[PDB]
Design a protein around this ligand. Sequence first.
Ligand code: NA
Ligand code: NA
Lengths: 118, 118
Amino acid sequence: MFKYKQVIVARADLKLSKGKLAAQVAHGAVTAAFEAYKKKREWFEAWFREGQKKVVVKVESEEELFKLKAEAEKLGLPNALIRDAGLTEIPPGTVTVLAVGPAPEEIVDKVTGNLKLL
Amino acid sequence: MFKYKQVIVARADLKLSKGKLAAQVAHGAVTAAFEAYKKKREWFEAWFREGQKKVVVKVESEEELFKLKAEAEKLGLPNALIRDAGLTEIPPGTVTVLAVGPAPEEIVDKVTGNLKLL
Ligand code: NA
Ligand code: NA
């Protein structure tokens, strides 16, 4: 009776235009979805046919994305920290979003439950 | 020497909040990515390791998404027309975005090249 979800944490301090931010969120969702597909197949499958729920939250620094990624790693959650070579309006290698999940909602919330909604 | 990309067409007439629109764009990207993975594996693989380029464009009606989906189908392009049962702020079954690709840029552009950027 587990519910599954993916939470994408987007940086709101990069002054990115909406189309670019949406693209970054999509990079995170796709990348983490494939991470789950290959190493947590059951979680991926359940999520994918139960609405593939996604919630977009935000942070105001690059540092918070790294700390959240570390927490996701420590809990064994599929995740993807995104950088985009094509996003030249920000410095090369700058991370834009962190996608966490798909995974059981209660586990994902341990990492992202207190983040604020975009 | 083919370049690959995925274009996600989002409806800008639904008055959706940014977090929800980004989530819908992500649904499209993930769904179409898996469509390509299963029926155009080569296109998916190239795209996925070459930056998985995504561009977000918009339309102002549900009707345009259907016409674009038909065009994508006629050109044999992986695509995903999205509806979200959890998006209750709009009528049930309402389509929100159409993701086209990954596929060679020149083919994708035949469908989305004249759409305006979000
Ligand atoms: Na660019
Ligand atoms: Na909802």
